[PDB]
Amino acid sequence: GRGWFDLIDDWLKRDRFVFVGWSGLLLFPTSYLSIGGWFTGTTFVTSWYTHGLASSYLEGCNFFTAAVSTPANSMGHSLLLLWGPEAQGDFTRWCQIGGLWAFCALHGSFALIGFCLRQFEIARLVGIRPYNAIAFSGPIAIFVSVFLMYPLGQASWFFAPSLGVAAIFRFLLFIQGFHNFTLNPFHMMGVAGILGAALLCAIHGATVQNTIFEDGDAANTFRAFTPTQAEETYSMVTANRFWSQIFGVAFSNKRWLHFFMLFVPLAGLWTSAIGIVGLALNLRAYDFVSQELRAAEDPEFETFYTKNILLNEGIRSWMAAQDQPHENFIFPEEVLPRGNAL
Amino acid sequence: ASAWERFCSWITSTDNRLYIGWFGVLMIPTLLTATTVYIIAFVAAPPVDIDGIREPVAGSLLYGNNIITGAVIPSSASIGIHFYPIWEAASLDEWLYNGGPYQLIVDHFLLGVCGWIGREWEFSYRLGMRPWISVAFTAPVAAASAVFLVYPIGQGSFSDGMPLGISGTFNFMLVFQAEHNILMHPFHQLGVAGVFGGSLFSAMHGSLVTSSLIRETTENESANYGYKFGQEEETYNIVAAHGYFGRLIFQYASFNNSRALHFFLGLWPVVGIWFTALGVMTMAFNLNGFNFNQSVVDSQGRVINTWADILNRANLGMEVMHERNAHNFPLDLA
Amino acid sequence: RPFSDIITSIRYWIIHSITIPALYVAGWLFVSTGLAYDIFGTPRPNEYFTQDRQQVPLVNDRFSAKQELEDLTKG
Amino acid sequence: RIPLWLIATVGGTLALTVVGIFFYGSYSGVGSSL
């Protein structure tokens, strides 16, 4: 406590309303600089000079169509430092080349780092096992793979997910049309993890709320629990019987149940991260070659896979001109892939 | 002491390995029929003229599909939502030509999952446990009825229901987005919030329960064996997890009550999936997601694009390329 | 002290009958003055296009980006 | 000294008014197709 480092450590780890910790020296600035940056970029900054779009409430957009659009494609993978050779210290030109996206993303990466360090620090000081910091590794993997490694494998930051709602929907459909990411088995494992985690959440909540022990005489049973009680508030045996005789199998071990609840979403996120890392290099599970050859030689062979491939071609051709204005794609109506009538 | 009484006791018996009950009386035959016909049609079934234009689509493994591309194709658009059992076909071959197995499987499966809801209620009553696990199950079932039944009813064709395959599921997604803009529809956004929050709260709850496990295990032994099935004591310190999560964000956010915590866990995904199932049910009758296309114009009045417009371009590509040979008129009113 | 204990205090509201509306109006004059369009470079409703610039403006070089930005934003 | 129910009432009323002004701006002026 006497030493200066000990004094700083004592103050940082003080038990107050907002725990600061040493990690707070990395979290609170960057996180703040991220969030306000988004609130700045989605409120005043435009995408007119990078995407040809309006992306601010000032330009007229709403919560859906407002976004912090990615930098211009000509920027490549520049760090887009405000003092860098692109903006050269000019705030206005920096915002106009979409450098605010680089600001938000690079500060958000370190904000995620600081928050995981915060989880580790609070787990250490409180004295519990650090399983919450390792479950946030899933979200960290998602952010790193989708916002950093994907554009770094592509031509520029331009193809990163623009920070918005409609921007993210455009990213979803762009990735589907150009990579066919639904066919990617790693995406399949990820959506399996997500939907299974939601399933586990719902079933666990219902089962626990519906095998509660009668610890009161009130019809509303929330007040019949004490935080410090050393008694389980619901019947594990009754829930096990219910799910065993309804579904054939059932959890018998609470610790296994709660580790499973952790493992499913985290495994899903990491699996889908592998798929997006694959998509960064255009290593895409785009096609099944056997069916492509059969449909090439058999013009009566049709599958839902081939219909999806045609839809992807439609997405690419009808989206490229307005989605990649830097390419200057002029596709006449003759060459655009169409169908009869509509 | 009567034959009917003994039969009712056996059906409602808590001694069978798998509980049957009266809802199981309807569930087991229907679900078994649906399983049998689905397996048989997925491994081997002739191509189906889904669009009613005499262009059969292959969905069976024997006809050159894999597990990813295989499907039980939706019914023919010529049928519409007319009931198409086997006995309403001139022959079984032409029953398979127009995708009757899809109608059979979908009807039996929907009845079976309704029976599953009721059977979940029933066992709970026999158990003496509180009801409502059944209510949670409804949200998954509601979505299944929305995609398999309500969307054909609104659009007027069983060809429009989701195919019983993986690639066909993606096809149904892309066509739904092209025709309805489901992503911008707020109920689907609530469903996305529901599933993402379900994953978040599942990971969080599992992490905090696993993190504060009471020491009941040696170092050369799995920590899970520190819990004995049917024990009376809690297997982890709720106070430790609650305090850690309070320090992590702020004290007021944490659920100090465990029952409220688990109610919230059961509530968030169930309500989210209810909302997205209802959203699909409403877009069945063509109440589409938001259309902010050309919503920003300059002082002259020319359109400055937004992300909604760029999303519209993808929707338009999918719209023009879907069912290339089925449409003879410019509007996709059907 | 607890949140509700502060909110119901009269002093809180003697402070925030004046402090909060001041900045709520400061934002109003921030944008109504047109100052946001100048700090952040956002075109006004009458600045997306101009003579010889009836097409979308795009930066096509990394290092001369400022130069062509002035050139395009000469106005 | 001020009952917190009245504070909550007035604050929620004002917040709903602000969101409704946002909704009106959504049906009027810039950002509206008209």
Binding site: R16, F17, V18, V20, Y32, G36, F39, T43, Y57, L58, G60 | V297, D298, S299 | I20, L23, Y24, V25, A26, G27, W28, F30, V31, S32, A36, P45 | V18, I21, F22, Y24, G25, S28, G29, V30
Partner: peptide, 29 residues
């Protein structure tokens, strides 16, 4: 002042941006 700093760092930009947004509703093209 750390409580003041945190709560007001959250609040002051929030009210400033909300005033700007409520003004921005009236830009009227």
């Amino acid at each position: 002042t750390f409580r003041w700093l945190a709560i007001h760092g959250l609040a002051v930009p929030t009210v400033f941006f909300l005033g700007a947004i409520t003004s921005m509703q009236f830009i009227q093209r």
